[PDB]
Structures are given as structure tokens and as C-alpha cells.
């Protein structure tokens, strides 16, 4: 009947809608994976900046202390 075709129509509506729902699920999921990898390389960047900054500061403090002891000796 009209109820039958209406039921089939809302049925295929539910089907296409859940299909697109799972689809954008997958899409946003890939995007979240990409963003997680971004965060991971970000923390890699944090660690590398930290170590290189610390190396720079080590050399700087070495220099400053050497100059300071030279001053104190003079």
C-alpha cells in the first residue's frame, strides 16, 4: 500500500543516512588519526627543541661562567 512504499522509502532513507553516518565516521576518524600523528610529531618537535635549546644554554652557561671566573681572577 501507500504505507508499504512509505515504509520502503523511509527504510532506504535510514539506510543511506546510516551509510553516510558511518562514512563521516570514517572520514573524521582518518582526520583524527592524522591529528594524532600531528600531535606525535609535535611532541617530537617539543623534545628536539628542548634538547637543542638545552645544548645552546649549556654552551652559553659554560661561556658565561668562564668569562665570570676570568673577571673574578682579574
Amino acid at each position: 500500500d501507500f504505507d508499504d512504499i512509505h515504509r520502503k522509502r523511509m527504510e532506504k532513507d535510514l539506510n543511506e543516512l546510516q551509510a553516510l553516518i558511518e562514512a563521516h565516521f570514517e572520514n573524521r576518524k582518518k582526520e583524527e588519526e592524522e591529528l594524532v600523528s600531528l600531535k606525535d610529531r609535535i611532541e617530537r618537535r617539543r623534545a628536539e627543541r628542548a634538547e637543542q635549546q638545552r645544548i645552546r644554554n649549556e654552551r652559553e652557561k659554560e661561556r658565561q661562567n668562564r668569562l665570570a671566573e676570568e673577571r673574578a681572577r682579574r
Binding site: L14, L17, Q18, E22, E32, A50, Q53
Partner: protein, 56 residues
Amino acid sequence: SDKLKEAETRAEFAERSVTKLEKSIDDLEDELYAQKLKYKAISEELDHALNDMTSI
């Protein structure tokens, strides 16, 4: 002498400032990632809900 004293002093201020900036940058980035991961966990909660909704 005045010039180089000035330059070294302001450079030291610059180094301390930039290191503070780097700590700030890392804290902000890590907090951003934590919040984004919480959001994606919420998104996968919603995606499990959508898989249920696949009932339609």
C-alpha cells in the same frame, strides 16, 4: 663598551625570554593535543552511536 654591554644584556634577556616562550609553547601544544584527543574520543563515542543508528 657601552654598546656591547647593552647588547649582551639585552641578549641575555632575550635568551631567558625565549626559553620561557618555549616552555609556554610546549605546554600549549601538549594541552591542545590532550583536548583534541578527548574530543576525538567523544567523536568515536558518537561514531559508536552512529553505528547503532545504522539501525536506520
